[PDB]
Amino acid sequence: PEVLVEQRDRILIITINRPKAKNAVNAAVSRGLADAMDQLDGDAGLSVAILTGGGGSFCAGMDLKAFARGENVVVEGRGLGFTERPPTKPLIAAVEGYALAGGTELALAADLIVAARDSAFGIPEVKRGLVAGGGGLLRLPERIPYAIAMELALTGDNLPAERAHELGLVNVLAEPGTALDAAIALAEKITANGPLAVVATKRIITESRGWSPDTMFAEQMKILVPVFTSNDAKEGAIAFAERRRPRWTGT
């Protein structure tokens, strides 16, 4: 299987299993990722997903051999796996080695990035006379300073993970080989919080980028009201009062 899926408590671990091809995205991998996100969002037993690449490399981008023969790597309505339709639940990318071109675009479509100190990002498409069309040009300038995003886009240069951490692209710098365990620790903190409040918090942040300051509080209030009337909200207050862990139901 070109994409491996493992359930661990409330956490879905998604592993691109194409290491001899540096985990490049073909049609198989693209469909596997989309299915994995449909599983994450559709299963009430899951809170967070982690995306990683096996064997020490995250993702070299779209498979060039598969692009050559004309495979349908881009699935209409999802893009490269999920670049044009990110999941509603939180997604963490855990990055070893190279995440280049489509690979950096997979990481950008996640919410959070955990990267080994020796890993690298980049969008080298222009070096081949191409353009990064998986959302890298639309998200990188919103994730790191605009001029740096512009530089990486125009040169195709690598962005080493230490610099990406300094620029705010990488949330956690991990020791080489341990990115996945650092992402699990981050995912376990997110799963310990209120499922409805977590999904509503991300929804407000992502959908507010297409809102207007005119109407930002009004729009946000519609998302807030179901969380504040939720059973979990009452359980949260009782558990904090009794100095114990809350037992979420997702209602």
Site for a second copy in 128-147 (CB under 8 A): 128-133, 135, 137-138, 141-147
**C-alpha–C-alpha distance, residues 52 and 140, integer Å:** 19
Which of 93, 80, 94, 89 lies closest to 34, judged by CA? 80
Out of 214, 229, 242, 244, the residue judged to bind a second copy by CB under 8 A? 214
Let me know if 125 is a catalytic residue: yes
Helix (H) or strand (E) holding 217, with range, is helix 216-228
Nearer to a second copy, 3 or 92 (CB): 92
Burial class (CB in 10 A: 0-12, 13-18, 19+), 48: buried
What length does the chain have?
A: 251
Kindly list the distances between the CA atom of residue 225 and the CA atoms of 82, 89, 209, 250, in Å, as whole numbers in the listed order: 29, 19, 20, 15
Q: Taking contact as CB under 8 A, which single stretch among the options 4-12, 28-36, 96-104, 240-248 is the one that binds a second copy?
A: 240-248
Residue 159 backbone phi and psi in degrees, to 5: -105, 100
* 44 binds a second copy, rule: CB under 8 A: no
Residues 54-113 that bind a second copy (CB under 8 A): 79, 84, 90, 111-113
Residues 142-201 that bind a second copy (CB under 8 A): 142-151, 153-157, 166-171, 186, 189-190, 192-194, 196-198, 200-201
Helix (H) or strand (E) holding 138, with range, is helix 136-143
* 248 binds a second copy, rule: CB under 8 A: yes
* 31 binds a second copy, rule: CB under 8 A: no
Q: Taking contact as CB under 8 A, which single stretch among the options 6-14, 36-44, 176-184, 234-242 is the one that binds a second copy?
A: 234-242
- Say which of 84, 125, 188, 235 is annotated catalytic: 125
Least distance between a second copy and beta carbon 138 (Å): 5
**C-alpha–C-alpha distance, residues 97 and 58, integer Å:** 6
Nearer to a second copy, 71 or 84 (CB): 84
**C-alpha–C-alpha distance, residues 22 and 144, integer Å:** 26
Least distance between a second copy and beta carbon 146 (Å): 5
Which of 64, 204, 192 lies closest to 128, judged by CA? 64
Out of 45, 70, 210, 242, the residue judged to bind a second copy by CB under 8 A? 210
Structure tokens at 77: 């309505």
Q: Taking contact as CB under 8 A, which single stretch among the options 3-11, 50-58, 174-182, 220-228 is the one that binds a second copy?
A: 220-228
The footprint of a second copy on this chain (CB under 8 A) covers a number of residues equal to: 77
Catalytic residue positions, numbered:
105, 125
